[PDB]
Design a protein around this nucleic acid. Structure first.
Ligand code: CA
Ligand code: CA
Ligand code: CA
Ligand code: CA
Ligand code: CA
Ligand code: CA
Lengths: 338, 338
DNA sequence: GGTCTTCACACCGGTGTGAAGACC
DNA sequence: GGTCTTCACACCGGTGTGAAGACC
């Protein structure tokens, strides 16, 4: 659970434990002795708790302490099962912490979207955790889908085939010259729900925790909307980084460039929304570095100049993230004609 | 020295030792106990040896072993001076190793440029280490300067004021909209020697080692050419990365974009040369990812499409790096009219 | 053609130093 | 206005997992 019950750890199966011993099964070119089972850790720590939608103590806790509970729970479990032999490298802890941050934020926004869709269909406004009720006029067509994308996803297969054909033609034109257009997959995409999914009830129900079935459900939601999204129905793109550095912060920027290059240039979309979430921006000057214009059209001067990234946000709690997502949905879904 | 003499370490002063004890002088928000004196390490290990221009054993040694000798020499010194108390974090070792790689490669190419300039002035062809003599017709005006740039250098102050005025006007036009054009400083720049420096003899003499005076000489060479370089006289840009990762490799690309944006767009330069040097590209697919077109003009189609980065090079030895730089100079300086 | 096995994606936290800073 | 002090730049090496792979 969230507080490391000893009995719960004892009742776990060997393959469900937060730490896997691989001292007799080494990795090819690695010296790792104990590995952090990321999905098992998520199921153990957040199997029945979702931040922002559980108790207030968990809703109002410093969100840096929420992201970090699985790692210390795993360390405690490893100390219990192995003694004087247990050790985990800090780099593995950093990798797992970043992945946990991404997945937990995605789940929180998934529950926010579920509540929004339930309100839009006219089933009411859930009130067990108290949030401001949106003032937008309800309409079934103002429904949103939150997709957490895989690591090596191309993100253009979500588009309708007619909009995919021009992108593929441009890519093949570059390919014929021996060139390419590589990029890293953005973390999360918030889009408008397609017409044929406007009545399905699985976009309206909240999840109780981050169990493995729920992990699979939230990790496979992108396949359902594949090839069904209009270019102009991509409402938000979010990149998550647990901490910032003066050199790493340039990775999302390139992303936010290439995406725009394929949306405002080859499809005529109004403007792409792209923001970065972080928990520790200290030691850098990212609040100024992100006030940077998009590298697109600057060499021509044929259009208005705007920024590559929408904003840098540091959520103090998960309730604040929920409130921000609700306000963004309320302010942006007005542009959709019901 | 290169092989860690004990007597040499004993004869060193306290402030010249490779490791500084800061257990009584902590850093503000850091728990570091022993810090790696990077410049002291460079002076100790390479104070009288420059790879590619010393003995063949050092010239033909695996260049991964050459970059790494200072770190192990420092570890040995720390074990000698402190016992059972000495420990250095791996992250500090990585940072220092990257900086050492950059500085050593810069020094090697500085000596190569010195030999090239000596040949161009007509003083002969040095032969103590045997390299192929360039076949280009000698001419004083085909001389090159190798500048190692600082960490936070803007790199546009090297340009002539007339070419700087348009860049500043473009930057101010973006600034008036609240936008900006930030980028990271490229590591090394090889440019054409200015006219008024065509006879000075400090661009023709090689350095015996990486002593602190020579470190200062090679670190301050950019100030001499500040405000004196034509936009079309920038011949090569080199970024150094000791190892590659699938996410980090995007940092130079953005660089290679922005530079081109300011040279082929606002100054009419023919094409910008920009390459990346690395020692370990395994675990990635960078040889394909760098076969990527520059993000400039793609939205207009008003010019030819080419790649942002010239090539990815993995030097097995320092002699190979010297030979590659000599061949590049021989092939490119022909375009300069003597 | 199932299963076992390897490999690329992207993940980030501890750093040395030049330069802006701050109070005398 | 010298000196002492803090802060942003950029530096990279150890990783869990989904998916391509390879030999039966
Ligand atoms: Ca991701
Ligand atoms: Ca993702
Ligand atoms: Ca991320
Ligand atoms: Ca550098
Ligand atoms: Ca440099
Ligand atoms: Ca570098």
């Amino acid at each position: 659970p969230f507080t490391y019950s000893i009995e719960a750890t004892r009742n776990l199966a060997t393959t469900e434990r937060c730490i896997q011993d691989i001292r007799n099964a080494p990795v090819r070119n690695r010296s790792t002795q104990f590995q952090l089972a990321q999905q098992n850790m998520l199921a153990y720590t957040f199997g029945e708790v979702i931040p922002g939608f559980a108790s207030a103590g968990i809703n109002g806790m410093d969100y840096r302490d929420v992201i970090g509970r699985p790692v210390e729970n795993a360390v405690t479990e490893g100390t219990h099962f192995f003694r004087d032999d247990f050790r985990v490298d800090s780099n593995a802890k950093a990798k797992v912490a970043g992945d946990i941050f991404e997945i937990v934020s995605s789940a929180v926004m998934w529950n926010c979207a579920a509540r929004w869709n339930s309100l839009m269909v006219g089933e009411g406004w859930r009130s067990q955790p108290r949030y401001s009720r949106p003032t937008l006029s309800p309409s079934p067509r103002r429904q949103v889908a939150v997709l957490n994308l895989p690591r090596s996803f191309d993100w253009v297969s979500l588009l309708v085939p007619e909009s995919q054909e021009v992108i593929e033609e441009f890519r093949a034109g570059l390919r014929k010259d021996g060139l390419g257009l590589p990029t890293s997959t953005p973390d999360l995409a918030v889009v408008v729900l397609p017409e044929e999914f406007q009545n399905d009830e699985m976009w309206r129900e909240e999840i109780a925790g981050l169990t493995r079935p729920n992990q699979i459900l939230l990790s496979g939601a992108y396949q359902r909307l594949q090839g069904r999204v209009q270019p102009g129905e991509i409402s938000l793109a979010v990149a998550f980084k647990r901490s910032l550095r003066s050199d790493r912060l340039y990775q999302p920027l390139y992303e936010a460039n290439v995406m725009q290059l394929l949306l405002e240039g080859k499809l005529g979309a109004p403007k792409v929304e792209f923001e970065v979430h972080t928990l520790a921006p200290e030691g850098t000057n990212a609040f100024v570095t992100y006030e940077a214009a998009s590298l697109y059209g600057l060499a021509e001067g044929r259009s208005a100049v705007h920024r590559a990234i929408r904003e840098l946000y540091v959520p103090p709690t998960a309730a604040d993230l929920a409130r921000r997502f609700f306000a963004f949905l309320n302010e942006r879904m007005e542009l959709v004609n019901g």
